Each structure stands twice: as C-alpha cells, then as structure tokens.
Amino acid sequence: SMNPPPPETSNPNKPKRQTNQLQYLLRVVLKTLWKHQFAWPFQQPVDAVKLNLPDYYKIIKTPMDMGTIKKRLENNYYWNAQECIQDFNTMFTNCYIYNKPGDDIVLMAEALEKLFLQKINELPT
C-alpha cells in the first residue's frame, strides 16, 4: 500500500529516566495540542491511502505524528526534552514541505505550531 508501518515507540534497552521537562511535555504541551480543534489530522500517521497521496512516503523520509510522540513519551523513549521537541519540529516540517503553502492543513499546522512554541517557552529549566 501507500502507507508504511508506523514509527517505533519503544527505545530498545534504554533505562528509565523521568524528568520534570518530560512530564511537562506529556501533560502540558502535548495535552494542549491534542485537545485543540485542529489536532485531528496530526493525531495519527498521515494516511496516504485514504487521502490519496501516492508520493507522501517517498517525499517524507521521517514520518512523525502526535500519536507517535504521545506513545514515545509514555514509553520514556526520549532521553531529554530536546529529542521530543525535535519530533514535534519534524512533524511540522513534514507538513510544510509536502503541502502547498496556504492549504488548510498548513494553516492548521501553523496554528498548532504557534501554540506549541508558546508552551515550550514555559518548559521547566
């Protein structure tokens, strides 16, 4: 099909390390974005079959979505906040490089990204 398997969500052999920043990313940042009116296209991997995007997974080399980020946080996949933040940035970047500027999905992504950046400004030190 046009769709790959979803990204891995468990980090093999990685010891558990909890931090305030990771708790904030899961319970504040991701929660706020997930509940936003524009979150739904980003809550699971892009469905290239349903949307008829034959080249999506040719163009986008590192797929990412909020569902994957959520599971990664829950599984303590990330060693630090910066790794989690990079996955969010990849998600937004993928949208901006694939979709025509001005498309609904791009406007939605931009709104979510503005909120993301506001919440990351209050990341614990």
Partner: peptide, 11 residues
Amino acid sequence: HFPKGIKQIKY
C-alpha cells in the same frame, strides 16, 4: 500537488 483537501466546509 496531491492536496489533502479541506478540513472544514466554507459556509
């Protein structure tokens, strides 16, 4: 482009 389409009907 392969647009995704609209995510809300504009009326």
